[PDB]
Every structure is written in C-alpha cells, then in structure tokens.
Design a protein around this ligand. Structure first.
Ligand SMILES: [Cl-]
Ligand SMILES: [Cl-]
Ligand SMILES: [Cl-]
Ligand SMILES: [Cl-]
Ligand SMILES: [Zn+2]
Ligand SMILES: [Zn+2]
Ligand SMILES: [Zn+2]
Lengths: 16, 384
C-alpha cells in the first residue's frame, strides 16, 4: 500500500 | 505523491527493484533509497524548461539525458523531456530508450577504442585515410558530412573533425566480430553488427539491450573517464522491507579496455572541445573530454520530407565526461521528420556545458595522468 523513496541524501523525495 | 521533475527517474527506480527482487514497489510496502541528487535534478529541470540557461529555438525541441557517477555507475540525474506536460505519471522515459540514432558519438567506442585496444593503431598520431571510399564489399560511398575529403590526417584530427571515411575503414581493420565484442564490454549490443554501425547506432532489432540510449552512452563513456571499467547503470541504493529485512545493491565494474586505450581516447577527445567539433561545450577551467554526434536522413526522407537546403539532422548528440561525472545528451524532435537547424543543433552542447558547469563549479577540477606504457610527444601520445 505504501512505499517511500529517499534521494541520496536520504531525505524523502516521494511517497508511492 | 512525488515531484514532476522526478517522474522519469522514479520510473527507472520502480523497474530496477522489480528486476532484482521481483516485487513491485507499487503493490508491496517498502522504503527505497535511490542515487539521485535532488538539486541536480531541479537544476537539470530548470535547464530544459526555463530560458535562463539556454536558447531553445522553440518549445517543441526535445532533450533527454543521463548523468552518471563515473566511479560506480550511479545515476545522479535523468530527464527524458522538456516542456512536455500531461501528467500520466511514469510514462515513456526517453533517457533509457534506444529508438534514436546516436550517430557520430558511436565512433569512439565502436571503431577507435577497439583499434587502439587491439594493435591496429599504435599512436594518436597514426596516419589514417580520409579519401573516397565505399562501404566494404559494396559500391556505396561513405560520404563525409560535407561531401569533401581531407586526405592523410592523424587519428586524433580525424576523431576531432568527426570524419566518417577513416572511421568505417577503422572498423574494417578491427573486424566486426572483435568490435561487437568490445561493444558488449561497454554494455551495448546489436543482434547483428554492420559497417554502417561504425557511425550509427541504428539497428535491425529494437529491444532495449540493442542500441544506444542516453543511459547506455553515459555509462559507456564513463569507462573512459574511470580508466577502463564498465559500471552497470544504477538508480537504487537500498530497499528496506516492511518485514524488517533489507537488500543492499552493489555494482562491480569490469575491465572494458586497457588504461592505455582509455587515456588515449581521452586525449584525442579533449581536442574535440578545443579546436574540434565540440567547441560549444568547452570550458577552459574544466579538464573534461567529449564527442559530438549527428545522425542523418535516409534519402527517401531527404527527397520527400526535407524542405530547407540547409544543414539538417534528425538527432544531435553529445557525450562528454569529466574526472567525476559522465554525461550523455540527446536532442531532436518527437518526430524525426521535423529537423534540427541553425541554433537548434547547438542545444546538445550547451545543455551539456550548462549542466557540467554546475556539476563541477565546485568539486576541484582534476586532470588525467598518462599511464605507464605510454609517452607524450607533442600533441600526440605513443605506446612504448
Ligand atoms: Cl573479427
Ligand atoms: Cl579483421
Ligand atoms: Cl519502515
Ligand atoms: Cl559530428
Ligand atoms: Zn538550479
Ligand atoms: Zn586506407
Ligand atoms: Zn551487413
């Protein structure tokens, strides 16, 4: 249902 | 929820996870750590979409590219289009597509690198030939972009001026078989290779494993930069499972060519930007090296779809790289029948100059070190 993506700076950039 | 400037990149992310684990991040819970550089992305997004960084002859002309960390195949930016809105989240990413002809940028990895890597030529000063010549076994002339011939000239100069004749002949001496093999080493392959492939990535098949794409190119050229190692393009770092477990993604490069070859290709290509064809992507302070490329029309296309008697081309490319980041850029219209002319042909270099500036404005611009087994001699380099 949820999956988060973090850039290389581990700072979340999107939630899918 | 996700930003639009991350569409293309996020798509590649979703696919890589599936490929390795078999799970779809859209129908399963998990956190994924990618390799993107956010600001780099917004920067790249601004370059394409604004008018502050480069003069697009119009708002239709498309652009696509991939920036790779030469040291590990990590993709730190990718943007398949510009001014192309119609949010259909996760659509076709033109940065991984091989349906476009990369033309001239094909020369360095298909003819010249193999040549040097296999003994055919022993110095960047070797005399190659730019004289009337037909495709091997055929009577079809290999025409230089301007219909002229330079005569005897050095390897370097022929690579720097992007002359076709000495390129397709080089592939002849290297042998198609050896050449196709050398291409695989860089991640590129064709179901079948032919002499036209000496200056074109156009191929009979069209999977994804066949052809060249901004992704593949930037990863191929990265091998020159990193010294001769081919790094699989990587978008994902790690994926933590909902059930607590984690899967770390590691990439291990392979020797694609000897360091000698890499150094040599790099030296001839540094000249491309200086007095060569890649002048519009030149930076005095940045020790980089690249190759410009142009594809061409059939002839049926010329006699039935091209108006102007101007210099036209369905694709303009650039695949430059530094001591840190390799970057391949594609430019053309959605429909190859709409040509690139005048100031439109210059966008590939600029976008590259622009982006590469930003990417190296700080760092600490380093140069390359002539490897043991070679020795300078004025403009050129020779083997011991
Ligand atoms: Cl062969
Ligand atoms: Cl041979
Ligand atoms: Cl969690
Ligand atoms: Cl060219
Ligand atoms: Zn910016
Ligand atoms: Zn000859
Ligand atoms: Zn053939």
């Amino acid at each position: 249902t949820s999956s988060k993506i973090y850039d290389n700076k581990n700072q979340l950039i999107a939630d899918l | 929820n996700y930003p639009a400037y991350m569409d293309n990149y996020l798509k590649e992310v979703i696919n890589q996870v599936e490929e390795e684990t078999g799970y779809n991040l859209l129908t399963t819970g998990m956190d994924v750590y990618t390799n993107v550089d956010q600001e780099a992305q917004k920067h790249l997004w601004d370059i394409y979409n604004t008018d502050e960084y480069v003069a697009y002859p119009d708002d239709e002309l498309q652009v696509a590219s991939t920036i790779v960390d030469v040291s590990n195949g990590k993709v730190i930016a990718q943007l398949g289009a510009r001014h192309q809105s119609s949010n259909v989240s996760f659509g076709i990413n033109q940065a991984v597509e091989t349906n476009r002809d990369w033309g001239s940028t094909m020369k360095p990895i298909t003819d010249y690198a193999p040549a040097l890597e296999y003994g055919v030529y022993d110095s960047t000063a070797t005399i190659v030939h730019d004289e009337p010549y037909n495709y091997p076994g055929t009577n079809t002339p290999v025409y230089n972009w301007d219909r002229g011939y330079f005569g005897n000239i050095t390897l370097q100069y022929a690579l720097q001026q992007s002359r076709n004749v000495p390129a397709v002949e080089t592939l002849n001496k290297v042998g198609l078989n050896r050449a196709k093999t050398f291409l695989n080493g860089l991640g590129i392959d064709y179901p079948s290779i032919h002499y036209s492939n000496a200056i074109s990535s156009n191929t009979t098949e069209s999977d994804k494993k066949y052809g060249a794409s901004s992704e593949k190119m930037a990863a191929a050229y990265a091998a020159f930069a990193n010294g001769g190692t081919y790094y699989k393009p990587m978008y994902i770092h790690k994926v933590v499972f909902s059930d607590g477990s984690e899967k770390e993604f590691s990439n291990v490069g392979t020797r694609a060519m000897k360091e000698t070859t890499a150094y040599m290709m790099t030296d001839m290509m540094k000249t491309v930007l200086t007095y060569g064809t890649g002048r519009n992507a030149y930076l005095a302070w940045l020790p980089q090296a690249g190759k410009t490329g142009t594809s061409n029309y059939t002839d049926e296309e010329i006699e039935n779809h091209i108006k102007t008697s101007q210099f036209v081309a369905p694709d303009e490319l650039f695949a430059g790289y530094t001591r840190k980041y390799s970057m391949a850029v594609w430019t053309g219209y959605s429909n190859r029948l709409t040509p690139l002319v005048g100031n439109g042909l210059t966008v590939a270099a600029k976008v590259y100059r622009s982006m590469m500036t930003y990417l190296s404005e700080g760092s600490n611009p380093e140069d390359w070190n002539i490897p043991e087994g070679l020795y300078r001699n004025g403009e050129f380099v020779f083997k011991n």
